[PDB]
Amino acid sequence: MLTDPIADMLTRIRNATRVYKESTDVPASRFKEEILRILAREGFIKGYERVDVDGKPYLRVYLKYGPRRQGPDPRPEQVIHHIRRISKPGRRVYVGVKEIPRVRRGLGIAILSTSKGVLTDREARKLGVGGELICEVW
């Protein structure tokens, strides 16, 4: 069984990008659609669309990469240099508004899930609310 699904989307993406795929299909849920809305908005993924695959609905995430490179190893810089889950089933993390983290000195985000919704860090801090801290990205 998919055991943490969100961690598995984050991972479907991680694997996809390290082999530099153009797109990747991850199985679909509103909470993942949210997690992605934020990625798109934030610049990590190109976007995503929902699709039906043998009837079972999915979402293609479409990934961004840097331009090609020089010398040995032309392979373009990664846009998501990394992405890591935080609250996992069976150890959960929640953060009061005054523990919400500064990610790589701000050059990256942390998706929080909140009472008010699913948000980035600047988002909640300035929104003023805390939550279950899903993951971080740079």
Partner RNA sequence: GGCUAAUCCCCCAUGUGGACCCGCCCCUUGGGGUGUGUCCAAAGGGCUUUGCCCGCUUCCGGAUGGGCCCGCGUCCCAUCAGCUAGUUGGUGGGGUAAUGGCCCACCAAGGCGACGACGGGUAGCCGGUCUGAGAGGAUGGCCGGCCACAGGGGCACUGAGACACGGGCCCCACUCCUACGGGAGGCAGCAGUUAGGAAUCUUCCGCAAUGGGCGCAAGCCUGACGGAGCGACGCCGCUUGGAGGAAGAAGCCCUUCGGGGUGUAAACUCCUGAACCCGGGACGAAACCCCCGACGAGGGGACUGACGGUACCGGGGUAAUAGCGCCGGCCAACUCCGUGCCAGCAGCCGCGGUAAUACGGAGGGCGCGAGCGUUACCCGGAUUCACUGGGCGUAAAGGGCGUGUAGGCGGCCUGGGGCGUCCCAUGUGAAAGACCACGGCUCAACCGUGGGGGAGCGUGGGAUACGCUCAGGCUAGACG
Partner RNA sequence: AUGCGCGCUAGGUCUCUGGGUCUCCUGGGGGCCGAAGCUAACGCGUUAAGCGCGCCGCCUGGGGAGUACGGCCGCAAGGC
- Residues forming the site for another protein (CB under 8 A): 90-93
C-alpha separations of 103 from 20, 108, 109, 137 in Å: 25, 5, 6, 8
Binding segment toward RNA, per CB under 7 A, in 26-34, 36-44, 63-71, 102-110: 26-34
78 binds RNA (CB under 7 A): no
For residue 118, the tally of other CB atoms under 10 A from its CB is 20
- Contacted by 93, from another protein, RNA, none: CB < 5 to 8 Å by type: another protein
Residues that bind RNA (CB under 7 A): 1-5, 7-8, 10-12, 14-16, 18-19, 21, 24, 27-32, 34, 55-57, 84-85, 87-92, 94-98, 113-118, 128-132
